[PDB]
Subunit: 78 residues, 3 copies
């Protein structure tokens, strides 16, 4: 099935996460906020991959990321 990622990432590191998610085939949506918030539905078995991306891009290096992995009952694509 599928999952929903809500990754709260720092704004300075938002630019590069946004670019690098694209390069890893991750379709994501940025909710503007000032500390930017991302939304990304990924496959059940691609959770470890996206978490790696978010960590390599942002976190305590300075930095800091907090992400939630949430269940999805249904996915539709019109």
């Amino acid at each position: 099935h599928m999952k929903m990622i809500i990754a709260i990432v720092q704004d300075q590191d938002s630019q590069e996460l946004a670019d690098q998610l694209v390069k890893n085939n991750f379709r994501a949506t940025k909710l503007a906020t000032t500390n930017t918030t991302f939304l990304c539905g990924v496959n059940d078995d691609r959770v470890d991959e996206i978490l790696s991306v978010i960590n390599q891009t942002c976190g305590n290096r300075v930095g800091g990321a907090t992400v939630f992995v949430m269940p999805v009952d249904a996915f539709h694509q019109f």
Copy 2:
């Protein structure tokens, strides 16, 4: 029980979805983004209805909608 809809819809079609959701008694919230993102808690047995609305308003006609249906453990109304 209840569900949560996260419908990522195109901005040109956001205006009309926003209006038409009201006409179908769907209380929804628009998170501004440029590709706008909607949030809408609907009843367990009104998922098919709202999906119809979103499709009739937006999708590949040009267009394109992507929606997630997510479980809700509790709903409160103060």
Copy 3:
């Protein structure tokens, strides 16, 4: 485990909820909207506390709050 709160609160009462959540050790994120929308992952056994806060701050006194409590499969903190 943990939960995710999506609290749709009125804008006039958003300022004070935002301040008072901090005073109760609730790390939350505000998604700008005009009727503002909040996001807050809290512990499994701190749902009653945050609901109290939201009610004391906003609701029908004038007012009005609507909140969803949603399951979280995984929480990560980089």
